[PDB]
Structure 1
Amino acid sequence: PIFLNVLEAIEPGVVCAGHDNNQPDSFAALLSSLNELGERQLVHVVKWAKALPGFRNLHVDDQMAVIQYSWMGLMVFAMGWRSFTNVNSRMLYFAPDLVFNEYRMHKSRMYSQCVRMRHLSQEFGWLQITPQEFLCMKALLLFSIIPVDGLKNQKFFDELRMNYIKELDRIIACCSRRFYQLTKLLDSVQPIARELHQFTFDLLIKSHMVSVDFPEMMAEIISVQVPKILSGKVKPIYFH
């Protein structure tokens, strides 16, 4: 099980948000902590992505771009898994020090998005998603969004995506009905990431007004990479 040995080995550890849980809840503090957590998660996602089997087959310019486009979806997917395993989808487990209950979902003004992420969390239980399926699905999520004008070397990306889909087939084989369920679950991440992309974009544009902090590396991606997705230049690869 060489492929699965690697995914398990490179799987990031626990990442905290650094949120002050002794403050009474506020919109500004909650989303500043989400933004800070997004910064910290991005660092771990880059190190995770670069250690993936066959990742440096990609063109150097494509490596960071692919991570930055998939970044939000990857965070959402892993968070849903965290939520399922830690609290049985009762709350959104963004981090040990940032667990969203229904009040915090409302307070963040992302209630609709949180509800859909809670549904995603529950689907891990309903579908009985194994830890190994999760790891392969999450790796496949990285290679599930590309620019319409094409990557620097689209062929290497296409080959790499195909290989990860093959590994998912092998994990399933031990098939058709299962592959259908998992690809449908993967597809459901993209609409959620879209809504979050739109929401964090708007928040960045009015950040100065609402007193929400955006780290340097966050402001860049949400101002440079995310608008390409929102403007239709970069689109996700849907199975169905």
Structure 2
Amino acid sequence: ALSLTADQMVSALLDAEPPILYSEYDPTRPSMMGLLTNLADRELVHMINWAKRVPGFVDLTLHDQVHLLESAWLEILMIGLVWRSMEHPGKLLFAPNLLLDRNQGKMVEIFDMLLATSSRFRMMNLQGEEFVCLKSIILLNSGVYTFSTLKSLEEKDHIHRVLDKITDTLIHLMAKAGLTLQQQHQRLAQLLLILSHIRHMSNKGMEHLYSMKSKNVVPSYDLLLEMLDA
């Protein structure tokens, strides 16, 4: 996995991309949290099958894969939602049959930040290749500071090696788009600064799910491990 070229690492991420799902509702009938809850639960399954295809991820122990998924899953859903919404200014495309504006999201604070992130992606003309690299970064980075045995330290070192390889891959893509060296690292910095906004949005979202104090509203270690299908 540390041996793949930048072109190969991109093609692997593009072929691993999960599908866009539809919301589960009756369109002949006149409950939003339940609809979004249900949609997120079903997206989560496809995310985990995507993560398994992220080069270097299945080199980790199953325990460490679950930990990274635990820390990252909501950021990963959110960046996909924001990517999906780039072409629909003012609205969030949770699903092709569930395009919502901010007055329906009424809570609204996170909705507004997702819309802002979608705008910035849009006016940056974020490319498909770049977006799948950013998803990989979130998966590996979000849990890397919340793991200290010997083995864990080897696992952290491997995660940092793969993150360096994703960085190289992103720069390769900007180089191939014709950007100058200065423009390459300026764009790389802009894209990583947005990931900290996405982390903030995920933090507020997780804060809301934990305040529900409801057993099956935060994916458990066992639920994620089951979806990983050892």
Go from structure 1 to structure 2 and tell me whether the alpha carbon gap of 1:128 and 1:187 turns closer, same or farther (over 3 Å shift): same
Amino acid at match of 2:92: L
CA 20–13 in structure 1, closer or farther in 2 if over 3 Å, else same: same
What is residue 148 of structure 1 aligned with on the other side? 146
Q: CA deviation at 1:22?
A: 5.1
Q: Secondary structure at the match of 2:220?
A: helix
The whole-number CA distance in structure 2 between the counterparts of 1:165 and 1:37 is: 31
Instruction: Count how many residue pairs are aligned between Structure 1 and Structure 2.
Output: 205
Q: Provide the aligned C-alpha RMSD in A.
A: 2.3
CA distance in 1, matches of 2:219, 2:49: 19
Give 3-state SS (helix, strand or coil) of 1:94's partner.
strand
Counterpart mapping for 1:1-240 below 5 A: 1-21=7-27, 23-24=29-30, 29-85=31-87, 87=88, 89-106=89-106, 110-146=107-143, 147-149=145-147, 152=152, 153-174=155-176, 175-202=184-211, 204-205=212-213, 216=216, 218-221=217-220
Distance in 1 (CA, whole Å) between partners of 2:8 and 2:218 is: 38
| Percentage of pairs with the same residue | 21
Unaligned runs of 5+ in 1: 208-213, 226-240
Q: Alignment partner of 1:93: what SS?
A: strand
Distance 1:112 1:55, change over 3 A: same
Q: Which runs of 5+ in 2 are unaligned?
A: 1-6, 177-183, 225-230
**Which deviations, in whole Å up to 9, do the C-alpha atoms of 1:89-141 show, x marking residues without a partner?**
221111122222222111xxx11110000001111112121111111111211
CA–CA distance in 1 between the matches of 2:85 and 2:146? Answer: 34
Q: Aligned-pair distance for 1:50?
A: 0.2
Change (3 A) 1:99 1:20: farther
- C-alpha contact 1:141 1:186 (8 A) present in aligned 2: yes
Please report the TM-score for the alignment, with normalisation by the length of structure 2.
Answer: 0.81
Q: Is the 8 A contact 1:19 1:97 kept in 2?
A: no
Higher deviation after alignment, 62-71 or 95-104: 95-104
Deviation at 1:20, TM superposition (A): 4.1
Q: TM-score, normalised by structure 1?
A: 0.77
Q: Distance in 1 between matches of 2:128 and 2:118?
A: 13
Q: Deviations 1:205-236 (Å, cap 9, x if unpaired)?
A: 2x6xxxxxx8x4x44439x99xxxxxxxxxxx
